[PDB]
Homo-oligomer: A and B are copies of this chain.
Amino acid sequence: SVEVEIFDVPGAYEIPLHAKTLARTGRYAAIVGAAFVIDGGIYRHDFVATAVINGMMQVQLETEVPVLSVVLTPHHFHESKEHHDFFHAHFKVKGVEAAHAALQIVSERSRIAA
């Protein structure tokens, strides 16, 4: 009964504007943004993550459309073989949690909308 549409963006920095553009057309009861923001060991990465999270919250408050966050920043990721498998396995659990959260929040908004 629920249809999912997939949109591609180059990086996490491009997510808030795409979400705002998609939300203003109606047609969607919720929006999910997924990204993997890691520390590459050369440049600082916290600025971009903070900007993306804040922008997603701002778009959510502006357009009155729920935005679920699957933008995750691990404590350590050294691109080793051990690190790859762990997060490769954990993102499935993250996706299931996001699906449950989206369903619940849409139902709750529909209920309180009388």
Contacts and interface: CB of A to CB of B under 8 A. Distances in A.
A85 B78 CA distance: 16
A79 interface: yes
Q: Which of A42, A78, A82, A83 neighbours the largest number of chain B CB atoms within 10 Å of its CB?
A: A78
Interface in A62-114: 76-80, 82-83
Contacts of A80: 40-41, 79
A79 B77 CA distance: 11
Q: Is the interface of A mostly helix, strand, loop or mixed?
A: loop
Contact of A82 (B42, B78, B82): B42
A36 to B, nearest CB: 15
A40 to B, nearest CB: 6
Contacts of A41: 76-78, 80, 83
A79 to B, nearest CB: 6
10 contacts: A40-B78, A41-B76, A41-B77, A41-B78, A41-B83, A42-B76, A78-B78, A78-B79, A79-B79, A79-B80
